[PDB]
Amino acid sequence: MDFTTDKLRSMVRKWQTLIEANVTVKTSDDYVLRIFAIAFTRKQANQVKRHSYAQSSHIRAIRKVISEILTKEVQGSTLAQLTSKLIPEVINKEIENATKDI
Amino acid sequence: SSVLADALNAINNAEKTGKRQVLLRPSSKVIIKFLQVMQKHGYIGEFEYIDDHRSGKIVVQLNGRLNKCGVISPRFNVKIGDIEKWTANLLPARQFGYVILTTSAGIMDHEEARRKHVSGKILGFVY
Amino acid sequence: KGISSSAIPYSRNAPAWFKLSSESVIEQIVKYARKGLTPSQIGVLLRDAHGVTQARVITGNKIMRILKSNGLAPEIPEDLYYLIKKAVSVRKHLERNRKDKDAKFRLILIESRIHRLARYYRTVAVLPPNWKYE
RNA sequence: UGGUUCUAUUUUCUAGGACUGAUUAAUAGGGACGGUCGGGGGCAUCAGUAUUCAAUUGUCAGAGGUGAAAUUCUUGGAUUUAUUGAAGACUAACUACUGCGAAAGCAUUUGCCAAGGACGUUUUCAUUAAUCAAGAACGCCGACUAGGGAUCGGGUGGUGUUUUUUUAAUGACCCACUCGGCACCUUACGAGACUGGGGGGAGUAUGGUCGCAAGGCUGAAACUUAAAGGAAU
């Protein structure tokens, strides 16, 4: 699976940070997959400072929980189960819910 | 730098910038006597020694009448016969300002020193 | 340079809620020192848990004098000891990996700082002369 | 730790003797601690897609490159396309009048190794300090007042929204204050006294000195001399 280049070029904006992670996970079959992840630091509503950067320890902690919960979503899936899991974009919702604490 | 020199530097350039109060820290007996003789001649107003337990602070109030403080950094001895010569060589004019000396009878200006007839080492000037 | 130090109060009394004894503090001090803590650690533990503000105020004198009068003197002052062990930790790092030019530079700085207060302590003769840093 | 002897009920309690004696705690300096902070360093690890090369297909006549061309490769299949491998680098956008480092400099992940700074501190030492010739490592000004907006790191307080719950602790934003930084925009006030060098800028003249430079068809001069060429026609 792969994005088009225009999608992530349409996502990258300055005055934020992109946290990107990747893990090499073997599924419940013996397929081994290198699976990536990108995420961009939002600014809250009522935020008046123009930056909304992460403090790089928040980046390490966010990237840690990204790696842990998506290597939990693999190993607990086959290829067909993982494909049906990442069609309706719901591992992204798992990452968002698990990371809004940070 | 010294401890009398930076106090007199603060009390100089604060008055040049036109403030009505200086806070100078730290504070010694020689600083108290120097401000004592210059308020005896009317260059500063009141001043107050806030005692913290470290070394002391002074808040001087000063109106307009000073235009230069200083210290003479080698504390050379002067004589009663050469008080007039040293005032002539370092003061602005003939009767303009006072040279302040550390004497046997304490910190005094030059004209009080030669009034009660005692010499000493030079400390600094005010005019 | 930054201004971040501790601000000693103007009072020199016990704070009038300090109901403990002026001797049980000394017994706790010598107990912690004999179980093996540096005097700064004695002071911070005594301040945090058994709430003596500072022991020069609440006891008679400062706690290195308390330890030296109760027999628990240091071999070498705490400043020199901590700088010595930091210098030898950097020296073992340098023998381990030898392309750390920045850590060589910090070793030159730490060794200069060793020599400065070792010279001070030697002219005071806290520690004996003919002391070298090995 | 050792030893001597004094009081009343088989064992209770006792008295004495030999192996320290000045201040603070600098909006000076150092050291410890705490939660941290950073693209500071070293080692190891991980990834990324380009590029180059190679293998395998598919297809066929061109591909580079230039202002045009050319050297070069190419029916023994170049360029293009797809799959895969190998190599050496490099760390795109995020990336900033931001950060860190003594400077040169430093940008992928994770871990280890030591380090460092700012902050917090009712911790500790107590003048241990500042500047630089020599030497060593790496390689509009100042002694000067106030501010203002924005930003980076820490801290305190407030009390709303994102957060959330009996697994650990831990956020993000808003506001005020405060400390310390990289800058920016202003203000007020001060004597602030890899070594070797002729003398301003723009020009002008030259009966001086040192140079370089003209003539005149070539051949062709001792020879009025060929062929051929030039010029004008």
Side-chain angles (χ1 to χ4, degrees):
Chain A
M1 189 264 257
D2 199 341
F3 274 177
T4 61
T5 75
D6 193 60
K7 188 62 216 311
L8 64 158
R9 275 200 279 102
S10 90
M11 284 194 284
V12 169
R13 187 169 29 185
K14 93 159 56 167
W15 298 339
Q16 63 194 34
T17 44
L18 63 92
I19 309 107
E20 45 179 12
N22 62 327
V23 282
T24 302
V25 194
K26 188 260 289 179
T27 177
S28 275
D29 309 335
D30 278 24
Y31 297 98
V32 56
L33 305 170
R34 180 154 298 124
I35 171 164
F36 295 80
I38 207 164
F40 296 91
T41 296
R42 213 183 66 207
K43 56 146 70 186
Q44 290 217 340
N46 86 331
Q47 160 160 354
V48 308
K49 82 179 180 189
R50 55 165 210 273
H51 268 188
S52 89
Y53 287 165
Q55 217 190 350
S56 76
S57 88
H58 307 137
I59 283 178
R60 289 194 228 94
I62 276 163
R63 187 186 286 130
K64 189 145 177 288
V65 306
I66 280 180
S67 281
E68 294 253 31
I69 72 173
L70 91 96
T71 204
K72 190 186 56 70
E73 292 296 347
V74 194
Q75 319 162 332
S77 314
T78 46
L79 252 188
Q81 277 182 346
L82 171 66
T83 308
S84 79
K85 171 169 294 202
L86 63 89
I87 295 321
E89 276 200 359
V90 80
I91 171 169
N92 310 142
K93 198 73 193 192
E94 290 325 289
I95 297 178
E96 168 183 357
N97 279 271
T99 204
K100 48 176 50 160
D101 194 17
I102 304 174
Chain B
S1 88
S2 196
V3 70
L4 186 45
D6 49 348
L8 265 38
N9 280 146
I11 213 166
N12 269 334
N13 54 67
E15 199 210 14
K16 290 292 194 168
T17 66
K19 317 209 299 181
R20 301 265 316 173
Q21 264 178 348
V22 193
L23 182 134
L24 61 94
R25 40 165 310 268
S27 153
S28 43
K29 281 178 309 167
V30 67
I31 296 182
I32 293 298
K33 292 281 295 194
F34 211 94
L35 304 191
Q36 199 84 258
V37 55
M38 82 168 54
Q39 75 171 354
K40 183 205 166 304
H41 294 319
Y43 285 113
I44 57 170
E46 292 196 318
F47 58 99
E48 180 139 342
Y49 170 90
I50 293 97
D51 164 80
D52 45 17
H53 274 327
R54 272 80 58 189
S55 314
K57 313 194 160 190
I58 313 297
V59 186
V60 192
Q61 56 207 59
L62 73 176
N63 43 7
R65 297 195 25 86
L66 161 66
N67 33 11
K68 184 69 70 179
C69 286
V71 287
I72 321 288
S73 40
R75 310 288 153 95
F76 47 81
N77 196 4
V78 313
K79 301 291 186 298
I80 310 183
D82 288 332
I83 277 169
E84 306 99 16
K85 195 166 299 175
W86 268 115
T87 46
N89 301 122
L90 70 94
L91 275 195
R94 161 80 194 279
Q95 297 310 118
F96 208 93
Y98 304 97
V99 174
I100 297 164
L101 319 163
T102 167
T103 56
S104 75
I107 304 291
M108 275 177 314
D109 54 82
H110 80 268
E111 86 177 0
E112 188 180 12
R114 89 182 160 209
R115 173 166 77 98
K116 58 181 49 53
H117 208 273
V118 48
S119 88
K121 319 169 92 186
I122 200 171
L123 195 65
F125 60 95
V126 62
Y127 54 90
Chain C
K1 285 294 172 192
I3 45 163
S4 71
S5 68
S6 62
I8 306 304
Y10 182 67
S11 88
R12 280 162 169 178
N13 301 267
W17 46 260
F18 190 71
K19 292 300 198 177
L20 295 195
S21 157
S22 175
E23 195 63 40
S24 68
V25 174
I26 318 183
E27 299 326 289
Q28 182 82 246
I29 282 169
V30 304
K31 151 185 176 177
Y32 280 161
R34 197 175 300 119
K35 77 192 283 191
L37 311 168
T38 51
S40 304
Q41 202 59 229
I42 316 292
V44 64
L45 268 168
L46 265 290
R47 185 206 67 210
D48 292 331
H50 310 87
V52 45
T53 64
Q54 54 202 11
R56 192 186 78 253
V57 163
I58 284 176
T59 66
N61 40 4
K62 38 170 71 79
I63 70 173
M64 191 171 273
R65 197 69 176 253
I66 278 175
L67 292 196
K68 213 187 88 62
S69 68
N70 283 311
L72 301 152
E75 190 209 305
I76 175 173
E78 193 188 356
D79 305 31
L80 196 48
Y81 163 68
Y82 271 117
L83 274 154
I84 275 289
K85 62 171 281 196
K86 172 176 290 203
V88 76
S89 181
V90 183
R91 182 161 265 100
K92 296 198 177 315
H93 177 91
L94 258 59
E95 71 90 7
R96 209 157 311 124
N97 49 7
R98 310 157 45 88
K99 311 189 185 184
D100 213 337
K101 311 206 168 193
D102 163 84
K104 178 189 177 182
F105 177 72
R106 271 95 171 99
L107 191 57
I108 302 179
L109 253 56
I110 291 163
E111 281 208 356
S112 165
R113 212 140 67 246
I114 279 285
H115 289 148
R116 285 186 160 258
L117 92 164
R119 168 194 313 122
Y120 155 74
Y121 276 136
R122 252 192 305 267
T123 70
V124 162
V126 164
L127 89 174
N130 316 117
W131 193 97
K132 283 309 175 314
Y133 159 50
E134 59 181 326

